[PDB]
Amino acid sequence: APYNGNPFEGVQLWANNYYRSEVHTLAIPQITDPALRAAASAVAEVPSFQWLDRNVTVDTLLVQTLSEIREANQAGANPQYAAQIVVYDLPDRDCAAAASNGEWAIANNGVNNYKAYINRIREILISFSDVRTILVIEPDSLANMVTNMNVPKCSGAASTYRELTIYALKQLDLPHVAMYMDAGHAGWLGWPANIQPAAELFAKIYEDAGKPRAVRGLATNVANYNAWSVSSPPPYTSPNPNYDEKHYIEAFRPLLEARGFPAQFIVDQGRSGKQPTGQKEWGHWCNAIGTGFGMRPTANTGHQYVDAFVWVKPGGECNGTSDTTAARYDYHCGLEDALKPAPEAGQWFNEYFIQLLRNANPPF
Ligand SMILES: *[C@@H]1O[C@H](CO)[C@@H](O)[C@H](O)[C@H]1NC(C)=O
Ligand SMILES: [Ca+2]
Secondary structure, eight states: OOOOOOOTTOOOEEHHHHHHIIIIIIGGGGGGOHHHHHHHHTTSSOOOOOESGGGGIIIIIIIHHHHHHHHHHTTTTTSEEEEEEEEEOOOOSSSSSSOOOOOOOOGGHHHHHHHHHHHHHHHHHHTTTSEEEEEEEEETTTHHHHHHHSSSSHHHHHHHHHHHHHHHHHTTTTEEEEEEEEOOOOTTTTTTHHHHHHHHHHHHHHTTTTTOTEEEEEEEEEEEOOOOSSSSOOGGTTOOOOOOOOHHHHHHHHHHHHTTTTOOOEEOOOOOOSSOSSSEEEEEESSBBBBOOOOOOOOOOOTTTEEEEBBBBBTTSSOOOOOSSTTOOOOGGTTTOOOOOOOOOTTTTTHHHHHHHOOOOSSO
């Protein structure tokens, strides 16, 4: 069914069974403290995004989640449930990273692979038109075109990133869908030197895709730890005047809007409840210590440019291994402020889940 306006209005957000199963089968059996067990049970009910970060998730997880939401809705959920999905499988993924877990390469049929993936997602979303579906498009993609064009892999991938982003925006432009393109975070694109070039890029992409109706705007702070709004700059932010997501968005939106894209925002707060964090530097993104579960997902943001506070990166799923000998080891995961020992990316990291619970704000 179609919708008008903020896609988070008029619906409840579904808490998916993948994250719920992680908490109940992997986390809780390792927790003996009664209060931490009850807190863990509560966090399993908080609705976070489900990531299509490997092709095999499309005909498994996506179908299962949509099917379960349809069942719940037909069983009288009121308001009806909506889905929250991340599209995250560009070829030559994460072009500026030390290592990437992306499965596809431009040199090994990756363009065709990606187009087919988007096409299959489109078929499934059409099947499940009755389930309003909110998408984050490709974290750690186009932000690289703003600041990392000096990196050979990024320069070589840029036309592909742009073309395939446009492809997804047009193919997924369906009446029951909303899309938010990833736009980095305050400590990446929010630096004053980067903010106008970033606005130029995202507004051009939006134009070149034909300003698809389903595109609501941009997502920020995905898989990062930034504050929404704090009174004092965390020490690792200096001297960026845009030291939280509110400052970033308030500076960013006017530049985007003058360029034709009056973007609304969603802001990840799933690991933002403790401020400042235990990061020693802003660019230390992997399994950062001293972080907490943050404000609960809601459409009631109170801010004119923010459609929702969300939990995009699910807390407890590892950002990368601390094993320096692993094939896809990223040195960020070995830093002094990265919790260790850490399993492979995507594996449940229970010590990190417990950290998030202990530092949760609001508490569980
Ligand atoms: C991706 O998964 C689909 C099924 O959803 C399958 O048909 C296709 O072959 C897979 N892609 C690749 C490149 O293996
Ligand atoms: Ca510093």
